[PDB]
Each structure stands twice: as C-alpha cells, then as structure tokens.
Symmetry: D2
Subunit: 89 residues, 4 copies
C-alpha cells in the first residue's frame, strides 16, 4: 500500500474501534445506573411499608386502649348498679 | 293490787320490754353490718377485675409489639433478598 | 282552768312544739344534704384531676417517642456520613 | 544476543512483571476487604446503639408509668382522707 493509503486506513480503523469501545462503556454504564436505581427503589418501598406498618400498629393500640376504657367503665357501672341493688333489709 | 305486787310486775314488764328493744337493735345492727360487708365485697371484686383487665391489656400490647417486630424483620429480609436478586447484567 | 281554757292551751303548746320539731328536722336535713354535696364535689374533683394526669402522661409519652425518633434518625445520619467518609484507598 | 540468551531474558522479565501485577492485585484486594469490613463495622455499631436506645426508651416509659400510678394512688388517698374529714355537723 501507498503511505497515504495506509494512513487513511489506520484512521478508519481507529475511528471504528473507538466507537465500539464507547458503545460498550455506554452499555456498562446503562446497566450500572439501572441496577442502582432498582436497588434504591426496593429500599424506598421497604421504608414506606415499614412506616405504614408502624402507623397501623399505633392505630391498633389506640383502638384497643379505647376498647379497654369501655370495658373498664362497663365494670364500674355494673359495680354501682350492684351496690344499689344490695338492700339494708 | 298490793304495792309489793305492782312493784314486782313493773320490774317484770320493764325487763321483758328492754330485751325486746335490745333484740331489735341487734337485728338492725346485723342488717347494717351485712349490708356494708356486701358493698365492700363488690367494690373489692371490681378492683380486682380491673387490675386483671389492665394486666391483660399490657400482655396483649407486648405480644402485638413482638409480632410487629417479626413483620418488620421479615420486611427487611425480603428486602436484602431482593437487592441481591437484582443483577448487574 | 276552764275546760275551754285548757283546750286552747293544749292547742297552743302542740302547735309550738310541732314547729320546734319541724325546724330540727330541717336542720338535720340541711346538714345531710350539704355533707353529701361536699363528698360528691371532692369525688368529682379527683375524677377530673386523674383525667388530667392521664392526659399529661399521654402527651409526655408522645413527646418522648417523638424525641426518640429524632435521636434514631440522627444515629442513621451519622451512620451514612461515616460510611461515605471511609475511603477505598 | 544469542537465541538462548534472548529466551532466558524474556522469561526473567515476564516472571518479574507477573509478580508486580500480582502484588498490585493483592493491594487492591486488601484495600477493598478493609473498606468493606469498616463499612460493616459502622453498620453493626449503629444497629447496636439503636437497640440500646430502644431499650432505654422502654425502661423510661415503664418508670414513668409506675410514677403515674403512685401519683394516682396518692390522689385517691387525699380523696378518701378528705371525704372522712367532711363532718355531718
């Protein structure tokens, strides 16, 4: 080959090989950013679900405390009822 | 009647009437002490039942808190499981 | 005394004595109603103060739970801070 | 150089260069394992401190609940004391 022909071929080859390398880097980086976004999404979902669990628990305890209060005041009303039902004879 | 006969009769009558009065007082007082002991017993029962209620409530809350903890650690294990299941491709 | 004079005197005496008896009953009943109203007022005050105590306790626990949450999230921020401060060298 | 001399030199050079490469890999891997062990240690410390926080909180609440109970029973004793201090006159 001519000196000018081998020059031009080298330039073509390097230009095409550069582009291959760049594409592969883009692929690696897309895969990594997608991996990382998924990991972060799962973390974010768990954090949310734990917050909702914690709020369910607090609502449950509050509802049960309120039921306990109803039973207590019932006990106190059966009490006074019974104390008035006891005659002096 | 002789003076000595009316004397002796008065003494008999007063002695028998005193005894009637005393018996009635004993009856009134028995009824009152029994009334009061019953009132006190019912109060004492209610106090006991409320204490047992309060301890049931505390055991229930403790058991539910412990269940919440199991669900939370389950959520965290499905989490790490899932984070390891996400490939880098 | 004349029959008509003793009649009239008896009526005066009974009328004045009735009024004495009635006044004493009114006094007994005033004292009893006042006793009972005071007892009821003290009971009512205690019931109120216990309710306010119970609400103070609940506000205190809620405030402390909220402070615990701040300390926990502080611990988690010193954590991530520290994990990023550890070099790969 | 002799064919046998260039052979022997190539072998020396490759052997020394291999060893350089291996050492660098060992260094990279030591740094990475140390990084990772430190990250894990900090995580492990935070987890511990949060557990101790959580147990302090529970002991605090239990102590305060117990103090509330003392104040309540004090209120009830000033109550009965006062109810007995109210005369019938």
């Amino acid at each position: 080959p001519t000196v000018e022909e081998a020059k031009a071929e080298k330039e073509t080859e390097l230009s095409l090989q550069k582009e291959q390398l760049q594409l592969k880097i883009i692929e690696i980086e897309d895969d990594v950013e997608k991996w990382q976004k998924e990991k972060d999404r799962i973390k974010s979902f768990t954090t949310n679900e734990k917050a909702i669990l914690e709020q369910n628990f607090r609502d449950l305890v509050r509802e049960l405390e309120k039921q306990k209060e109803e039973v207590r005041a019932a006990l106190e009303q059966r009490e006074q009822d019974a104390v008035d039902q006891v005659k002096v004879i």
